[PDB]
């Protein structure tokens, strides 16, 4: 319900006619949310079996 839905859509409905744009924005937010650097942590040596 990101766009073109506020005001008229029911709380439990989605508008099929606006699906592509809503999906598009949803993916965009998904993309933006992950824009971060993969830092390196400390390490330990494993001695557990295999």
């Amino acid at each position: 319900k990101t766009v073109l839905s506020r005001g008229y859509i029911d709380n439990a409905q989605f508008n099929p006619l606006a699906l592509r744009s809503n999906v598009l924005l949803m993916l965009l937010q998904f993309t933006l949310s992950n824009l971060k650097i993969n830092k390196s942590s400390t390490f330990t040596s494993d001695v557990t079996t295999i």
Partner: protein, 94 residues
């Protein structure tokens, strides 16, 4: 000395249309006048430059129409005007 306020000047958010007064008559001319008056210029010093100009306004739709509420609400209004009842009660229903 090195005042950032004098070095980091950039247009503010909603700059192109912020000063537009809420009206329906001649929004672009009115907005243009508001910008001129807001900037501190007085008409007696701008002279002929003030008569024909026009500026973007919030009252004008992107399609080029006079709007009085956010376009989403206009979409909502027309949508709400057509909502047939989902479940109706009639004697012959099986």
């Amino acid at each position: 000395t090195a005042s950032p306020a004098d070095t980091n000047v950039v247009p503010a958010k909603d700059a192109p249309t912020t000063n537009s007064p809420p009206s329906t008559t001649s929004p672009n001319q009115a907005a243009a006048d508001a910008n001129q008056q807001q900037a501190g210029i007085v008409s007696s010093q701008s002279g002929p430059n003030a008569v024909g100009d026009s500026a973007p306004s919030t009252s004008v739709n992107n399609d080029g129409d006079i709007i009085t509420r956010p376009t989403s609400d206009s979409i909502a209004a027309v949508a709400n005007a057509t909502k047939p009842a989902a479940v109706v009660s009639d004697p012959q229903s099986m």
